Amino acid sequence: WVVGMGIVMSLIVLAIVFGNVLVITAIAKFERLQTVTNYFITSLACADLVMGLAVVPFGAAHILMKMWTFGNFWCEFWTSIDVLCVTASIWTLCVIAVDRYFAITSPFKYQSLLTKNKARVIILMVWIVSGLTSFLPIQMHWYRATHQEAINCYAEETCCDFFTNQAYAIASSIVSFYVPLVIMVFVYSRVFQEAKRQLNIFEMLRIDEGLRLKIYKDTEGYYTIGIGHLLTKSPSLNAAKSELDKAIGRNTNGVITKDEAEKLFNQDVDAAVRGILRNAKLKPVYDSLDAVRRAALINMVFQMGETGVAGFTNSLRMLQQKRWDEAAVNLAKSRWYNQTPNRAKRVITTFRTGTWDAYKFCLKEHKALKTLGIIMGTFTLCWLPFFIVNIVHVIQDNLIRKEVYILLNWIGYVNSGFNPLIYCRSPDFRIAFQELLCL
Numbered sequence: 001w002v003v004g005m006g007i008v009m010s011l012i013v014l015a016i017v018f019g020n021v022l023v024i025t026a027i028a029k030f031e032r033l034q035t036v037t038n039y040f041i042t043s044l045a046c047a048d049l050v051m052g053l054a055v056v057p058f059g060a061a062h063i064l065m066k067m068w069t070f071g072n073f074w075c076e077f078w079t080s081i082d083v084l085c086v087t088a089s090i091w092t093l094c095v096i097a098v099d100r101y102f103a104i105t106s107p108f109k110y111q112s113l114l115t116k117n118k119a120r121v122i123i124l125m126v127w128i129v130s131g132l133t134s135f136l137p138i139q140m141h142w143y144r145a146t147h148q149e150a151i152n153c154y155a156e157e158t159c160c161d162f163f164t165n166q167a168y169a170i171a172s173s174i175v176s177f178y179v180p181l182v183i184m185v186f187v188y189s190r191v192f193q194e195a196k197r198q199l200n201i202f203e204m205l206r207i208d209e210g211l212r213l214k215i216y217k218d219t220e221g222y223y224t225i226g227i228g229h230l231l232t233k234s235p236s237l238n239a240a241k242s243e244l245d246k247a248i249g250r251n252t253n254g255v256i257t258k259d260e261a262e263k264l265f266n267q268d269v270d271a272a273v274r275g276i277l278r279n280a281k282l283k284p285v286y287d288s289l290d291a292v293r294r295a296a297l298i299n300m301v302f303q304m305g306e307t308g309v310a311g312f313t314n315s316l317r318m319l320q321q322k323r324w325d326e327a328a329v330n331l332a333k334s335r336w337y338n339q340t341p342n343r344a345k346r347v348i349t350t351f352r353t354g355t356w357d358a359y360k361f362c363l364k365e366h367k368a369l370k371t372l373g374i375i376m377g378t379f380t381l382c383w384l385p386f387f388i389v390n391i392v393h394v395i396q397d398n399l400i401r402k403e404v405y406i407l408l409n410w411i412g413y414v415n416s417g418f419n420p421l422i423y424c425r426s427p428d429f430r431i432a433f434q435e436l437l438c439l
């Protein structure tokens with residue numbers, strides 16, 4: 001049965017190396033992925049690669065042989081490297097957390113304030129400082145316990161149990177794990193809050209309309225481009241090409257850039273708003289509404305125009321009277337609900353709750369932030385037990401077993417393999433993985 005562990009432990013090392021060398025190379029070779037965030041992810045993957053190559057294997061040999069085989073020097077270095085990788089990870093995660101806060105609050109929503117060069121420096125500092133705090137206390141022997149069971153393990157070359165004194169145990173854990181952990185959970189929950197608060201009509205309509213850069217057909221079969229910019233009701237592609245050229249002011253050939261579609265969208269939302277205040281029936285309702293329900297109203301007029309939306313006379317009467325669940329029932333009784341539901345259901349829910357709850361993690365940059373959060377969340381779950389039980393061993397020392405300790409450490413080790421999987425949520429990372437896997 002001890003063979004079982006051997007296979008189990010060998011399969012783990014491989015997945016850590018395979019997975020992480022993939023992530024490293026994906027970013028190194030593909031420009032679409034050479035961003036500040038992915039620079040920090042490289043720092044993360046590096047730490048898990050050194051973990052898999054230099055750390056886990058000698059952890060498996062230690063367990064399976066019930067002894068150290070590698071002498072005192074590598075015993076010390078193995079420990080110092082191990083601690084480094086865990087520390088450099090969590091601070092890198094804390095940095096990712098911080099960088100995303102400054103991005104989401106800056107007018108340049110979703111893009112880092114740091115330059116690529118600036119990001120290289122932060123990483124280098126993280127590694128240098130982590131390299132100090134990890135190696136130095138160990139080479140200088142400041143970590144060491146003085147009780148007999150411990151001093152015996154030191155003089156014995158074949159023993160490499162991590163015995164420390166309670167002072168270092170507290171000091172190392174707080175500075176290495178707890179401080180960057182607690183900052184990261186507090187800061188990143190605040191980035192999640194900013195994403196949701198900063199949601200506006202432009203992102204809303206970008207979610208339930210998409211962006212296509214070449215001429216397509218809507219669900220009605222009318223020619224459309226950009227973010228739901230209708231070209232003509234006519235069923236002639238040349239008439240649609242004719243309208244595009246006039247709307248942009250150049251020969252387009254039925255294709256546009258992201259810059260050109262953005263100002264059509266900006267004119268379209270202006271128009272739907274200008275329509276609202278021009279219309280007799282729509283004007284009052286809009287004023288009565290909070291900035292969120294207002295956005296839902298614009299959304300509709302974007303899809304249907306003022307005349308069509310003013311037709312919901314029953315429902316418009318109640319949004320004005322703040323009777324939210326009564327309007328929502330009358331909006332479901334519609335051709336609009338029938339025609340397209342994935343989109344209507346969201347709009348109605350917005351009118352109902354007055355919240356963005358229906359649009360959570362629908363935007364690409366928001367899906368991107370969720371992934372990062374899943375990395376962070378998983379790292380916490382995998383390591384926290386170990387570190388909690390670490391510090392419980394300092395207070396009442398005779399409560400946690402060596403078997404329990406080692407096992408909780410291995411729940412940590414196995415975290416070095418989860419990131420590459422999680423990154424399969426990113427479409428940019430998928431296309432990258434398959435190109436590299438030749439598929």
Ligand SMILES: CC(C)CCC[C@@H](C)[C@H]1CC[C@H]2[C@@H]3CC=C4C[C@@H](O)CC[C@]4(C)[C@H]3CC[C@]12C
Nearest residue numbers: 039042043046047050054081084120123124127
């Ligand atoms: C002490 C031993 C065991 C581990 C040390 C590994 C060192 C050499 C590695 C781990 C992580 C690495 C960094 C991670 C990725 C960044 C960003 C990249 O755009 C340039 C290189 C740079 C700046 C790397 C420099 C070297 C680095 C610090």
Ligand SMILES: CC(C)CCC[C@@H](C)[C@H]1CC[C@H]2[C@@H]3CC=C4C[C@@H](O)CC[C@]4(C)[C@H]3CC[C@]12C
Nearest residue numbers: 024025027028042046049050051052053054055
């Ligand atoms: C004890 C053993 C595991 C240590 C082996 C050292 C390895 C992990 C280090 C030493 C130099 C490092 C590399 C130096 C900089 C490059 C270029 C960068 O664009 C991506 C990271 C990458 C590819 C690093 C990956 C990790 C690396 C290969």
Ligand SMILES: CCCCCCCC/C=C/CCCCCCCC(=O)OC[C@@H](O)CO
Nearest residue numbers: 011012014015017018021022025435436437
């Ligand atoms: C159950 C878990 C088992 C996991 C099974 C996986 C293990 C396979 C072996 C990995 C060794 C490491 C190989 C490194 C990865 C090679 C892929 C790669 O990086 O390719 C780049 C190349 O295409 C540039 O052009």
Ligand SMILES: CCOC(=O)c1oc2cccc(OC[C@@H](O)CNC(C)C)c2c1C
Nearest residue numbers: 082083086087162164168169172173176390
């Ligand atoms: C016993 C008291 O614990 C710590 O002081 C401590 O602080 C730390 C800070 C960061 C990383 C740490 O390593 C996690 C484990 O993979 C180490 N692998 C063992 C076998 C040494 C530690 C440790 C063990």
